[PDB]
From Swiss-Prot, chains A, B:
Gene Ontology terms describing biological process: symbiont-mediated evasion of host restriction-modification system; symbiont-mediated suppression of host innate immune response
Described purpose of this protein according to its UniProt entry: Prevents both degradation and modification of T7 DNA by the host restriction-modification complex. Structural mimic of the phosphate backbone of B-form DNA that binds to and completely occupies the DNA-binding sites of all known families of the complex type I DNA restriction enzymes. Thereby, inhibits the restriction endonuclease activity and protects the phage genome as it penetrates into host cytoplasm. Inhibits host transcription by binding to the bacterial RNAP and competing with sigma factors. Inhibits the host exclusion defense system BREX.
Protein name as catalogued: Protein Ocr
Consequence recorded when altering residue 53 to E: Partial loss of inhibition of the host exclusion defense system BREX
Species whose genome carries this gene: Escherichia phage T7
Pfam families linked: ocr
Curated annotation (Swiss-Prot), chain E:
Gene: hsdR
Organism: Escherichia coli
GO BP term (any one): DNA restriction-modification system
Record region (C-terminal domain): 848-992
EC number(s) per entry: 3.1.21.3
Name of the featured protein: Type I restriction enzyme EcoR124I/EcoR124II endonuclease subunit
Swiss-Prot record, chain F:
Misc. comment: Type I restriction and modification enzymes are complex, multifunctional systems which require ATP, S-adenosyl methionine and Mg(2+) as cofactors and, in addition to their endonucleolytic and methylase activities, are potent DNA-dependent ATPases.
One MF annotation (Gene Ontology) recorded for this entry: site-specific DNA-methyltransferase (adenine-specific) activity
Name the record gives this protein: Type I restriction enzyme EcoR124I/EcoR124II methylase subunit
Family: Belongs to the N(4)/N(6)-methyltransferase family.
Keywords (A to Z) from UniProt: DNA-binding, Methyltransferase, Plasmid, Restriction system, S-adenosyl-L-methionine, Transferase
Superkingdom: Bacteria
Domains (record comment): The C-terminus is required for assembly of the restriction enzyme complex. The individual domains assume different positions in the enzyme, allowing the holoenzyme to regulate the methylase, endonuclease and translocation states.
Entry's Gene Ontology BP terms: DNA restriction-modification system; methylation
The organism of origin for this protein: Escherichia coli
Subunit structure: The type I restriction/modification system is composed of three polypeptides R, M and S; the restriction enzyme has stoichiometry R(2)M(2)S(1) while the methyltransferase is M(2)S(1). There is an equilibrium between R(2)M(2)S(1) and R(1)M(2)S(1); the latter is methylation and translocation proficient but restriction deficient.
Function: The subtype gamma methyltransferase (M) subunit of a type I restriction enzyme. In the presence of the R subunit the complex can also act as an endonuclease, binding to the same target sequence but cutting the DNA some distance from this site. Whether the DNA is cut or modified depends on the methylation state of the target sequence. When the target site is unmodified, the DNA is cut.
Amino acid sequence: MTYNNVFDHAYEMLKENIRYDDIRDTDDLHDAIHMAADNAVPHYYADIFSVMASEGIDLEFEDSGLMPDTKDVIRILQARIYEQLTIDLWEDAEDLLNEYLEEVEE
Amino acid sequence: MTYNNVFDHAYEMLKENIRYDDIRDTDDLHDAIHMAADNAVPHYYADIFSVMASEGIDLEFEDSGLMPDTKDVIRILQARIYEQLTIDLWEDAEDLLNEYLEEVEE
Amino acid sequence: IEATDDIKDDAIKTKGYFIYPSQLFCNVAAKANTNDR
Amino acid sequence: LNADLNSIFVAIESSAYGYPSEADIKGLFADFDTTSNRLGNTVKDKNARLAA
Amino acid sequence: NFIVLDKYIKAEPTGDSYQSESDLERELIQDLRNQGYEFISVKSQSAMLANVREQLQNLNGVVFNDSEWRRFTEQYLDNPSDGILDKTRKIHIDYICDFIFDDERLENIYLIDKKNLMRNKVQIIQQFENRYDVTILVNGLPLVQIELKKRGVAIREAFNQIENSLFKYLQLFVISNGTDTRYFANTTKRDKNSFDFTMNWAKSDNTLIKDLKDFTATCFQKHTLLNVLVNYSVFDSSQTLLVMRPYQIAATERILWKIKSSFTAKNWSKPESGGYIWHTTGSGKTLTSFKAARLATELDFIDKVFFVVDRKDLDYQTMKEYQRFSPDSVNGSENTAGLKRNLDKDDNKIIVTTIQKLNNLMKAESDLPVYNQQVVFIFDECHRSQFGEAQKNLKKKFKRYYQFGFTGTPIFPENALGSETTASVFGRELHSYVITDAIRDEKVLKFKVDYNDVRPQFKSLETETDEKKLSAAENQQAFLHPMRIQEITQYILNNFRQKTHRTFPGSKGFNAMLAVSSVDAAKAYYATFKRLQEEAANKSATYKPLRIATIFSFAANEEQNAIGEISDETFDTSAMDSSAKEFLDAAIREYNSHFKTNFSTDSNGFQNYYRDLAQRVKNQDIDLLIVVGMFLTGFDAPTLNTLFVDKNLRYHGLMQAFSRTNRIYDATKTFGNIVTFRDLERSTIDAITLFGDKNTKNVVLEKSYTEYMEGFTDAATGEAKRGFMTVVSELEQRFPDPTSIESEKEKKDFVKLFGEYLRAENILQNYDEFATLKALQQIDLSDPVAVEKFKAEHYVDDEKFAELQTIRLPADRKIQDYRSAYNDIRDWQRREKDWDDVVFEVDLLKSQEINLDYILGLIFEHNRGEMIEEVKRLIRSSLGNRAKEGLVVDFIQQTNLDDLPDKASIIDAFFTFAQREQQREAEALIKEENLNEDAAKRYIRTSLKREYATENGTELNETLPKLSPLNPQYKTKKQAVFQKIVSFIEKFKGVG
Amino acid sequence: NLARMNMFLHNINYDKFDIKLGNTLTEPHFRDEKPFDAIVSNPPYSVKWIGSDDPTLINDERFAPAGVLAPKSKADFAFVLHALNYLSAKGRAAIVCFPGIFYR
């Protein structure tokens, strides 16, 4: 139950979205990133803790505003997972600007 | 790296304190509970997450005031571990009101 | 052992000599069973 | 079978799960009881644990 | 039926010659075929595997195909990575494989049928294909490996003479030569710790069995070999296979036979049912009780096995019993509901408990469910402080038990004081292992009891047998007369360095004890030492004094037992009076004043003082220790060979008192000097009477002085020894005296004689009369000042004085001559390498060293060039100083005695001259071979700090000049330079 | 193994430069050689060992000047009691510990 399992799910789902929607505008591509992102995060307690004990993702932040100012701890953890996945989907967007859209020409 | 490993450490340390201090007043017994409690909690990231993915302890609360109103997540998790261990040391105090102090009479 | 002519060695070991690096280094493998080989 | 407390050996019950899951007549809903296994580290520890 | 035999008919060949290894091998194979071991012939690994397959199919009743047998071989039996420890664990733990047949069922492939040993099948092979070896297969698996040796080869060197897959399964290596026989346990170690552990098989009365015939007839019985190899060998965790010594296996099978043959009679809980083992103290008693209890559990009808001790050992054996996990013998505290939970916590029914916890169990509870089961108690350390009433409670509140006890302190009807004997409590002496056997086993050493008969004034009092008057004569007259104390103390200060082998300054030596009776005596003793060391310092100021301390607390508490033991001494410093506490504090202040510590006289400072005092004796800091009661049971040191006694040591408190000396150290220490000052020889004979026959004192103690002087025939081993004066006569009358030895037979016979001389001399040095006879060689004659001081030291009337003047020792310069000749033989036959026949004596010649101090003393005191010859042979008398011959000669062939003002300055003058020539010779060794200069300088100074050199540590080869790592090189100038530098570092070993 | 090659890769020579396998507390060696000139350490957190003592090493060769001996879960201060043993008067010891000592 690594971080990379969740990232593989997000990578596959983003490939599904770009492959089946043919999105070639980067802002709509990042809207599809927002589509895939929460649709790839886990939901169980032990799964989220086993992802948070894994590599890649860190407890530290990129934006503290994504934290809801509330006492809902796994909401904050899932927001942190969301944040690390949005960064890794910036990297995946840099991959898929040149991965799939180039072959589809017929 | 269960919750019960940490509880066994706390149980052993509380036995050490009561056995070597001969505390027979319950308020000082609970001060020794506060002594053993933070002295038994783990410190590493992956250890705390593996305890939080285990049984017994739950993400839900007994007192939300133990949460520090801050963005330090594993401080909040370690406070939750502290809280569940204080409850389980109420139970351990009920055990050790009659476990060891009765035999020591010479 | 080059300390000088041939990179590629061979089974020319002359094992009376072989105890001298076994005292000197004590990792005395071969001349034809190294990672280059 | 539980009158044989700490009786060497284990595999009697593995025989005692062999035949009652045979019962091939008719319309089985068997092929069933094959989750009880062997681990365990040593066979005496396996015997003691299954007796427990 | 037993396996440690009582009665054995000693068999014998004819022969059928008893010399060659072919003979031993053929006769051994024939005898094993006669005992029912099948002989086969196997030429491959695969045929071994096929035999294993056939035997396992015969035993287990299963049938394989090649698929199942290949899977079982590759999966369980012969996994390639698994080393020796894995196979040994498979024999002792994982000896069953769960196996899935191809018709979809699971069975249990055994290897060793550990509950019915007769069903196993044994085979024998030899190797293929130098050595002559006999391997014994158990169900096709090789376990036992017998090796055979040349009969001239001593066994201590014969040990040092050390595909495939199945030969990783080996357990017992039996080594033999036809005469001696030892057996290892799974290829542990080498010569450095060789025969610490290599046992010998024996009969039940500890008499060793050594030759191969009786060892084959007794150890290699199928029942006995399988039963020893499986049921009596602990694979502890880890790197440890422990095979029990045969006196242990004796006691274990006596225990189980007595249980198993009492249960048939149904005769529990009565004093004829139990019994007792009596071991010596400190022989490895934990493993015996462990295996006895563990096999006591695995009888079916036996329910509970208790394993009781005295305070406060419980956590220690709770570890040691758990060294083979896991017997579940847990008792942290007596939670009485938790204790009866442990009584009901089933299936692993060995329980470690104190006598106090069981005591309070019988006190508090009275109607427990366990009190009608089958219960077996095993006790240990049964000194009578915590034992009496609990036996009465156990006889009351129990119904079915067998009680066994181990002990070191038995009680006999010979003893007294209103107590009750062991046999009337425990029963039969089941099996016992006394100090006489350990003497015969060469595990401890012999005694030497001496009565110092020197004071006619008090001879009546020190020889009185009335114990009522022994108690009644405690005053300042009968034992604490001041001249009594002074003459005893003067004897101690005059013969301390003689008894403890400190007659030479460069020697190592040992250190002693001093046991007294009372504290009020001991204060006077320590004050007497304090006065007389000052008086001895006020005579010459060259006398090296001695470091002396003391310890004593409290008390002769109760009577508590029979005759007659050391009182169990506690640690309450507040329990004494003011006077002894004051004296003890003053002694501790004088102690701290030299050792820079802060031990106090509370409980904790006194405890730490004791815990340090037991450390400083062990490394020769303190040379004499005044003692009332402590250090007489628990203390153990290899360099304490001398016990001075002024005490009424009786029956087997006496044995513990004497046993604190004779632990083995090397070839130098031979036995233990007990020097007494009261009548104790009759007490000694009456104490050793408790063991056995009157051959015992011929084995235990020592032969007399005259018997080592003259020669004898031993009634203990049938030898015919030559004594001393015969050897002295053989010195002169067999040699071109002294330095005319040239042929090979001359050299070999001289070594063979003079080693015997050195050995006999070292035995003699402990004596009194040989000390007097060496003292007679150094006297002035006449000078009746010197003769009167001589007779004052040694207490000799003039008839005996002239008689000692009659007996002639050889000249001391002749001793120098033969010692130098022996050393020259040793150094000439160290190079290359017929000579490798007789071991030279080293450790004796390792002693009597002169570390240049007595050399410089003779150089200073000599007045008046002419002395340059003398040191030239004095330096040939000490090995390891041959290189400094030329050094000291060139020190006195350059400077004069007028250059040094006195004795204390010429020392540092010599060191200065040595370093000044050292620098030049170092520069010469660098210049001569054109080395790497600073590198070789670092190498030389590192080798001087390390006091030798080696080819290891390549920085030497970094001092090779330009080009020599290469294979086409001589590498011979390298060895030449190596000889140069080892010559140099021997030339300056110890100066810098 | 990786430590023994770690100091092997950095051109350290053959003879002296070793690690012994085993627990430092239960089986120390060398005792004899020597009271050192410099020890450094980094004992890991929570390295517990059953006491106190499970053997008879309450009266051992080195922990006697401590008075009491360290329990299971607080084994870190065992190391410092080991530390002053193997150290000369010239020597100094640079060890690390958990901060949370009030008096424990």
